[PDB]
Design a protein around this motif. Sequence first.
Motif, mmCIF file in Angstrom:
data_model
loop_
_atom_site.group_PDB
_atom_site.id
_atom_site.type_symbol
_atom_site.label_atom_id
_atom_site.label_comp_id
_atom_site.label_asym_id
_atom_site.label_seq_id
_atom_site.Cartn_x
_atom_site.Cartn_y
_atom_site.Cartn_z
ATOM 1 N N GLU C 65 0.843 -1.184 0.000
ATOM 2 C CA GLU C 65 0.000 0.000 0.000
ATOM 3 C C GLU C 65 0.881 1.237 0.000
ATOM 4 O OE1 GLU C 65 -2.966 0.017 3.135
ATOM 5 O OE2 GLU C 65 -4.412 -0.760 1.676
ATOM 6 N N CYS C 66 0.470 2.247 -0.754
ATOM 7 C CA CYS C 66 1.201 3.498 -0.846
ATOM 8 C C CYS C 66 0.711 4.471 0.224
ATOM 9 C CB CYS C 66 1.056 4.092 -2.244
ATOM 10 S SG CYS C 66 -0.514 4.907 -2.498
ATOM 11 N N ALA C 67 1.302 5.667 0.232
ATOM 12 C CA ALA C 67 0.981 6.646 1.266
ATOM 13 C C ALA C 67 -0.424 7.209 1.084
ATOM 14 C CB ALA C 67 2.017 7.769 1.264
ATOM 15 N N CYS C 68 -0.785 7.564 -0.148
ATOM 16 C CA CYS C 68 -2.082 8.177 -0.408
ATOM 17 C C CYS C 68 -3.178 7.123 -0.495
ATOM 18 C CB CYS C 68 -2.025 9.014 -1.687
ATOM 19 S SG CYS C 68 -2.136 8.087 -3.233
ATOM 20 N N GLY C 69 -2.788 5.852 -0.516
ATOM 21 C CA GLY C 69 -3.735 4.756 -0.527
ATOM 22 C C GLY C 69 -4.526 4.613 -1.810
ATOM 23 N N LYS C 70 -3.930 4.979 -2.945
ATOM 24 C CA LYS C 70 -4.615 4.853 -4.226
ATOM 25 C C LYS C 70 -4.316 3.521 -4.905
ATOM 26 C CE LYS C 70 -3.323 7.802 -7.514
ATOM 27 N NZ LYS C 70 -3.053 8.234 -8.914
ATOM 28 N N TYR C 71 -3.055 3.097 -4.911
ATOM 29 C CA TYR C 71 -2.677 1.789 -5.426
ATOM 30 C C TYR C 71 -2.559 0.824 -4.253
ATOM 31 C CZ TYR C 71 -1.109 4.820 -9.286
ATOM 32 O OH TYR C 71 -1.027 5.774 -10.275
ATOM 33 N N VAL C 80 5.194 3.532 -8.225
ATOM 34 C CA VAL C 80 5.419 4.376 -7.060
ATOM 35 C C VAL C 80 4.170 5.208 -6.763
ATOM 36 C CG1 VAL C 80 7.831 4.287 -7.705
ATOM 37 C CG2 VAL C 80 6.606 6.322 -8.244
ATOM 38 N N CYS C 81 3.834 6.177 -7.615
ATOM 39 C CA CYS C 81 2.565 6.893 -7.615
ATOM 40 C C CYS C 81 2.627 8.004 -8.644
ATOM 41 C CB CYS C 81 2.197 7.488 -6.251
ATOM 42 S SG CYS C 81 0.870 6.590 -5.430
ATOM 43 N N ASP C 82 1.485 8.600 -8.907
ATOM 44 C CA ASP C 82 1.456 9.904 -9.538
ATOM 45 C C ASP C 82 1.356 11.026 -8.520
ATOM 46 O OD1 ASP C 82 0.951 7.920 -11.516
ATOM 47 O OD2 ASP C 82 0.025 9.416 -12.821
ATOM 48 N N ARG C 83 0.989 10.732 -7.271
ATOM 49 C CA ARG C 83 0.690 11.789 -6.314
ATOM 50 C C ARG C 83 1.658 11.823 -5.135
ATOM 51 N NH1 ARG C 83 -4.074 11.884 -5.845
ATOM 52 N NH2 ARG C 83 -4.366 9.744 -5.093
ATOM 53 N N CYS C 84 1.805 10.715 -4.407
ATOM 54 C CA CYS C 84 2.656 10.706 -3.223
ATOM 55 C C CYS C 84 4.006 10.046 -3.460
ATOM 56 C CB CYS C 84 1.952 10.012 -2.053
ATOM 57 S SG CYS C 84 1.565 8.270 -2.306
ATOM 58 N N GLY C 85 4.254 9.528 -4.661
ATOM 59 C CA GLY C 85 5.566 9.017 -5.011
ATOM 60 C C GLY C 85 6.123 7.972 -4.074
HETATM 61 ZN ZN LIG Z 1 -0.081 7.014 -3.358
#
Ligand SMILES: [Zn+2]
Lengths: 49, 108, 99, 246, 49, 49, 234, 234, 146, 99
Positions: C65-71, C80-85
């Motif tokens: 799980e990523c930081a922003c919880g999108k992926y 990685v992300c488009d938002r929180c990397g």
């Molecule tokens: Zn994220």
Amino acid sequence: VNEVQEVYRLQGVKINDKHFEVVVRQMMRKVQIQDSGDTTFLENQLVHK
Amino acid sequence: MQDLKNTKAPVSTATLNRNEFDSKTGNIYEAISIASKRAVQINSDIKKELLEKLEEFATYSDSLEEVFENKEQIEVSKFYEKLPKPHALAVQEWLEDKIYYRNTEKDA
Amino acid sequence: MARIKDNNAPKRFNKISIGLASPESILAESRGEVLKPETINYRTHKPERDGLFCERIFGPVKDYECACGKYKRIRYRGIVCDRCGVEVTEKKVRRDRVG
Amino acid sequence: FIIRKLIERGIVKTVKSAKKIIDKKEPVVWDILENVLKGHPVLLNRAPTLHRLGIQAFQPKLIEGKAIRLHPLACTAFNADFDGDQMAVHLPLGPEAILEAQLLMLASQNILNPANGSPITVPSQDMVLGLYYMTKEKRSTPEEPVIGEGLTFYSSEEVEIAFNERKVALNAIIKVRTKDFNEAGELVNKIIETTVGRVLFNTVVPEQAGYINTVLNKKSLRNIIGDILAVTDVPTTADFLDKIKT
Amino acid sequence: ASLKASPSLRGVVIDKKLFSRSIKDKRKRSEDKEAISRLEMDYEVKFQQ
Amino acid sequence: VDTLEGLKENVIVGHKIPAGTGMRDYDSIIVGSKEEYDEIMARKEEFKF
Amino acid sequence: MALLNFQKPDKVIMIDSTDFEGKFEFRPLEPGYGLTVGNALRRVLLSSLEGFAITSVRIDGVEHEFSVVPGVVEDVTEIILNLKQVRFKRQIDDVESETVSISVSGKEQLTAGDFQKFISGYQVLNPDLVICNMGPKVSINMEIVIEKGRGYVPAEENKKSNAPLGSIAVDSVYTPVKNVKYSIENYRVEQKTDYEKLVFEIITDGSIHPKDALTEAAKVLIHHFMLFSDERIT
Amino acid sequence: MALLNFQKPDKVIMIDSTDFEGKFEFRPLEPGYGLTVGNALRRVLLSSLEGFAITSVRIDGVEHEFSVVPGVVEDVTEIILNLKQVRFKRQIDDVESETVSISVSGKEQLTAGDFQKFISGYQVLNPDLVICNMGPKVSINMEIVIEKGRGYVPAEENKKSNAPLGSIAVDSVYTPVKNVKYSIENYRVEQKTDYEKLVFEIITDGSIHPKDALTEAAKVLIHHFMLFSDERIT
Amino acid sequence: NELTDKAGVPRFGHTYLYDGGTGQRFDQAATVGVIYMLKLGHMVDDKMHARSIGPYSLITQQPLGGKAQFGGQRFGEMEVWALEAYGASATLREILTVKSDDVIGRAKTYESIVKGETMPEPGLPESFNVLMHELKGLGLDIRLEE
Amino acid sequence: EVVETLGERILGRVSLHDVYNPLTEELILKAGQEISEADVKKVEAAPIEKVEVRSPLTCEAAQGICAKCYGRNLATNKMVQRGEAVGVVAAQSIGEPGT
Ligand SMILES: [Zn+2]
Ligand SMILES: [Mg+2]
């Protein structure tokens, strides 16, 4: 070996001389340099025999 | 696969004479190494045999929560449980001079 | 279920060498630069951006799980992300990633 | 191991169900564990571990209660008394580890002290006191007669028969025909003046050590165990140690 | 986030206690004011006795 | 450069210590049943002839 | 009804058995019963059981125990010790005291079986026991007395007024039982690793089988305990 | 036939015996048999006799054992410890358990004899035992379970999964025999001054008369020793 | 002595006792009396603890310590010395890697014991990696080479 | 006064030279052969007072010691075998009675 063994013998502790011999052998694996010569070794250097 | 119904290896631990155990190699550590490797092989063989035996009594019950009491499977598992352990079988093999060993580095 | 069988066996070695560490090696092994003396935000108790606990540099805190919880979940490994990397990987990478 | 046997028996198919069954403490768990224990020794350790005899492999058995039962003869090796001491149990897993436990760590193999070569599994306290009491001679006096004094026996068999029938005292001085070394080192039958307790002690002494005709204290027992290990092998010495402990 | 007994705890529950902070509400505040007035009156009664 | 020759280095690194059963020449031993090896070599000799 | 919760043993298991030795197993026994049963059986078996032995030996040319017999390697003490090992079994009923006169010549070894041709009321169980070693032209003449006794009786307590003059009193191992032992191991039933397991060992000289000795000891104990019945108390 | 010379004892003679204490004599006995008979009987008497005891108690207003009854001087732990000492005897044949509801009020002391009114299938042998001390206006409505067993059963093995709320499993002691003493004296038969007389002194709690305790112990020993017969050896 | 003579008790408490399992009187008289015995607070209930697997540390990846934490026993330096003296390379290796901090190895070993397969090959302990990371944080270039 | 007998001090070692009995002239101690109890009895019955034995102090092994250089494994009363960690055993044996 004898001096270390005397302490244990004064209180009735029997340990074979082989163990003290092994330790004393480990105590005399190095030599002290006093002439530099043409080697890479330097002065007053404790080096393995 | 050796006859597991007539093995003379002890079921539990016994005081084995080290002089007999390390007579063939001159080193008990070498004997332990050889016996442990043979024990691994014996364990693999016993596992294969036990899986083959258990595949017969593979009662296809889809339910998992309920405990199923299959008498034949329990009997087979009981038979293989009271056998000497693979290291004991390897020790008995070694004492009987039935283990073949060689050193690849020494033979090269 | 059983643990995932990681086939990456440890690389056997016979020696350990020690020496002075160059700045170039430290930068090359690093995943980022720690820019803030913060560890966790006092208002949210989450790792701070560019801090000592940053999830951009040292790895995600949650598993897959990523930081922003999108992926989320295993389907998104390596993104990685488009938002929180913050890379979507195992949180255990927080024991191996340096700054 | 219990989980493996539970899955093999067909009782369960998953690890969690096996764990639940184990935690419920069912009779099947104990039935499995009795056979699982066999051939799987455990390393017992008492801290501080001053020498290598502080870790010793023991073949475990299931017992009631919550305290580990330890053999008394191992106490001297562990420096362990029973006034509140605690021990740690470690379980070897691999076959090579179990082989090392059985062939290098087993307490029946750790008979000699590596420091000096003399035995370390020597009787102590109640055991030595009992052996001394059994092997000490008692002389008959008019006030206190000793039954069966001066009797001649054809073997240790007749001494056992007379002692079991309460016809000769344990400390009586008797003469028995038994095997003993001659001046050339060969075992020959001869009549030795000894005690009944000495005969009973020698019924468990290996015949290759001759006949022991001394009052048993700690020093004599240590020397005797060393001699028996010198002539015989380790298993015979272990059986002799167990018998004399009893 | 429950509390679970370790696999060594076997016992009988002999007492349980719950300590709580009263919730600060508007109606609870007015009720507290009325109760404190009544308690104050009772305690001046005790004072005078 | 440490070559990991003693017991302490191999204890720290987690490798087999170079003593007892962990000597380096015991890692190249191939074991098997004597009867199986004899049968295999007899079959090989029969095929060769 | 009285014994319902009791963990009774199944039956006696004869694990190994010969005409001389025998080991039996009693399981499962409730806590404290292995000791009771084993001690009772051992005490009954180690009492002064009935048997036959040699009570007097009279060798011609000998007048005292510390004398040399011409042509025989062993002295009188060794001959007596060997004679103490001769085991007898009754053949003719109602035979109690017997005197046997024995003359043996032309043999390099006088054994127990050589007495058989001269013994009528008894049978020698071990005819291959070396009583003495004699020279080539040595003729041995001896008179022995075979009686009936209980347990072990030393020489002092075994002297009889009917013995012929010049006889030497001999210690007699009348008892058939050589040795009785028991051990109590822990037996597991269900979750209880504290049940008991009795292992019994009987060594006998061969006159009685170990199983027969066990059954007779149990019979004696049963007869003794039957007297504590309601009908047998006044 | 070798065992026929044994001196068979006549019977067990009751010298004196009340319902609690008893003295018995076993005579004549062979040398050494008094010890085995007496020790076996003592072990069986102390170990394996049946009796009735309380297994569980429920007191109204009491949730667990570590509580207090309002108005009662003793706690519930002390009340349980006193209830453990209440001894019962059979009064009606063929009863195995009984749940007794007791309601007592108006008395300064609650004793065991107060339970006899509410008990139909048993008799309280020690009615003077003080269960608890109460005020003159304190009423106790309790319920006890009297069962049957042998030996000592802890509370963990008396816990019923279907017991009502407030039921406290109580440690049960079932042994009716309190003390066994035996002595061996010299007994003379004709010209023999070496026979034995076994003197028994048995103190029980009153649930079983000493004579029947002796008969039950003999029966248990006989049942164990019958398994040593020839037909029961394999 | 006066009180024992008044109570019908042998002097010095020297009495002849009888064995309960056999009935025979002991050969010598023994000291018998009444002693005041206490029960100390070191109970086997509080001392017994057994762990196969349980919680590990998040730093050292090693079993925790304590009965409350369901931890494991400590195999310290002296125990390792004893193991080395015996020559047990295998037991020491299992204690060092697969029983403590080889994260993959311990799971694979549990699976192999449950399934009966061969034991896994141990890997680098995690505490060694913690040591390496501390050394790198001290500015030392530590390199493992083959 | 004799506190430690020569037999108790040469038992288990390795005889460095072929030692002959000075009186009856037989080979009592063989070079490279462990001094067993029989050799101890023979020496105690012979006029021998000094025995030259191989010791760890005078072994020329490149790494560690070796079996003849050392002597007898006192834990097994046999010849010391290859792989024995004699140093740790020696250290433990010396240090155990220190308390
Ligand atoms: Zn994220
Ligand atoms: Mg202590």
